[PDB]
Amino acid sequence: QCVKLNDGHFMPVLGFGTYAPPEVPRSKALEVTKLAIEAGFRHIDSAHLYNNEEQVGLAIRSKIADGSVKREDIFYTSKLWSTFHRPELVRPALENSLKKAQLDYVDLYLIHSPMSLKPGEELSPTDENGKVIFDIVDLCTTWEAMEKCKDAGLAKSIGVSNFNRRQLEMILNKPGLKYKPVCNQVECHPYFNRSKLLDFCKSKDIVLVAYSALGSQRDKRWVDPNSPVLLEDPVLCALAKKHKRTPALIALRYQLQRGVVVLAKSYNEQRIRQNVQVFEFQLTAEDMKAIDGLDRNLHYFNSDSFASHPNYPYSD
Numbered sequence: 661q662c663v664k665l666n667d668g669h670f671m672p673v674l675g676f677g678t679y680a681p682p683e684v685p686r687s688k689a690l691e692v693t694k695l696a697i698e699a700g701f702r703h704i705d706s707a708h709l710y711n712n713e714e715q716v717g718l719a720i721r722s723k724i725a726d727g728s729v730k731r732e733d734i735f736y737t738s739k740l741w742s743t744f745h746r747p748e749l750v751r752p753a754l755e756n757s758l759k760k761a762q763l764d765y766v767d768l769y770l771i772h773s774p775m776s777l778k779p780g781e782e783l784s785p786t787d788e789n790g791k792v793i794f795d796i797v798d799l800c801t802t803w804e805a806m807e808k809c810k811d812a813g814l815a816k817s818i819g820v821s822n823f824n825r826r827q828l829e830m831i832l833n834k835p836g837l838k839y840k841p842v843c844n845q846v847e848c849h850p851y852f853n854r855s856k857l858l859d860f861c862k863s864k865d866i867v868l869v870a871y872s873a874l875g876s877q878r879d880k881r882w883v884d885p886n887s888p889v890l891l892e893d894p895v896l897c898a899l900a901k902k903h904k905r906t907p908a909l910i911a912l913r914y915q916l917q918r919g920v921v922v923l924a925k926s927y928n929e930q931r932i933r934q935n936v937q938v939f940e941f942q943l944t945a946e947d948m949k950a951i952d953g954l955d956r957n958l959h960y961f962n963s964d965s966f967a968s969h970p971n972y973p974y975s976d
C-alpha cells in the first residue's frame with residue numbers, strides 16, 4: 661500500500677534501496693533493481709551520490725519495455741548531492757539525474773543532506789585531516805530552487821533527508837514557503853527509532869522515511885564494526901520465531917506500524933523476495949512495545965569525516 665503525501669501525490673510505504681559500495685560492479689544495480697520490481701517493489705530509492713542512476717533508470721525502463729509496469733506504477737526517488745546546494749546548481753543537478761536515468765521526471769527529489777560541500781569536481785572534497793570541506797549555504801535558498809523544480813514538472817514531489825527537527829523547522833518557517841517537504845528521509849531503526857522527530861513530522865503531515873532500517877551495510881568508511889548488529893538482536897530474533905518470519909521482516913514491519921515509510925536494500929535475490937512479505941503479517945501492541953524498548957541512540961553513520969560539519973544533524 662501507499663501513503664498520501666501533503667502535496668496530494670502517493671508514495672508506496674515499502675521502498676527498495678539501491679546503494680551499494682563502489683567495489684560492487686555497476687551492472688549489479690541493474691540486475692537487482694529489475695529483481696526488486698519483479699518481486700513487487702514499486703518505490704525505488706537512488707541518488708547522484710550512488711553513481712548508479714544509469715543502471716537504476718535502465719532497470720525501471722526495462723520493466724516498462726518488457727510490459728511488467730508502466731511509468732505511473734513506479735515511484736522513483738533521487739537526491740541532490742551536497743556539492744550542488746547553491747540554488748543556481750539545483751536544477752542542473754536534477755537535469756543530470758534525469759539524463760542518466762533517461763526519465764522525464766522523478767517522483768521525489770530530496771536534499772540528500774544539510775551538510776553543504778565545496779562545489780567542484782569531487783563528490784567529497786576533504787582537507788588534509790580527512791574532514792569534508794564544507795560550504796556555507798542558506799538551505800532556504802536551496803529549498804526555493806527545489807520548489808521551482810516541482811513547478812517545472814521535473815520532480816512530482818520534493819523533500820529532505822538527514823535533517824533534524826530544527827533544520828526542518830527552518831524550512832517550514834521560511835517566509836513565502838510554497839511547498840512543505842513531503843518527507844524527511846533519516847536513519848531509523850529499533851536502535852535509533854527517532855520517535856520525537858517522528859512525532860514532530862506526524863504533527864506537520866511530513867512522512868518519515870527510514871534508511872538503515874535493517875542495521876545499515878556496516879561500511880568501514882562510516883560504521884564502527886564493534887557496534888551491535890541489529891539483525892542479531894535477541895528481541896528481534898524472539899519476535900521472528902513467534903511470528904515465523906525473520907529479524908529483518910520484524911524490523912521492517914515495526915516501521916510500517918509506526919506510520920514510517922521504510923527502505924530496504926538487498927542485492928541478494930532470495931532476500932529481495934523475502935522483504936516484500938512485510939505485508940503478510942502484523943505485530944501486536946506488546947510486540948511493538950518490546951521493539952520500542954530497544955532504542956539506544958545508536959546512529960551507525962558515525963565518522964570524523966562529517967561529525968565536525970557545522971550542519972551535522974546529531975548531538976553527540
Ligand SMILES: NC(=O)c1ccc[n+]([C@@H]2O[C@H](COP(=O)([O-])OP(=O)(O)OC[C@H]3O[C@@H](n4cnc5c(N)ncnc54)[C@H](OP(=O)(O)O)[C@@H]3O)[C@@H](O)[C@H]2O)c1
Pocket residue numbers: 676677678679680705706772821822845846870871872873874875876877891906908909923924925926927928931932934935
Ligand atoms: N539518505 C541517506 O543519507 C541514505 C543513507 C543510507 C541509506 N539510504 C538509502 O536507504 C537504503 C537502505 O539503507 P542501507 O543501505 O543502510 O541498508 P539496509 O536497508 O539497512 O540493509 C542493510 C543490509 O541488510 C541486508 N538485508 C536485506 N534484507 C535482508 C534480509 N531479509 N535478511 C537479512 N539481511 C538482509 C542487506 O544485505 P544483502 O544485500 O546481502 O541482502 C543490506 O546490506 C540505501 O540503499 C539507500 O537507498 C539513504
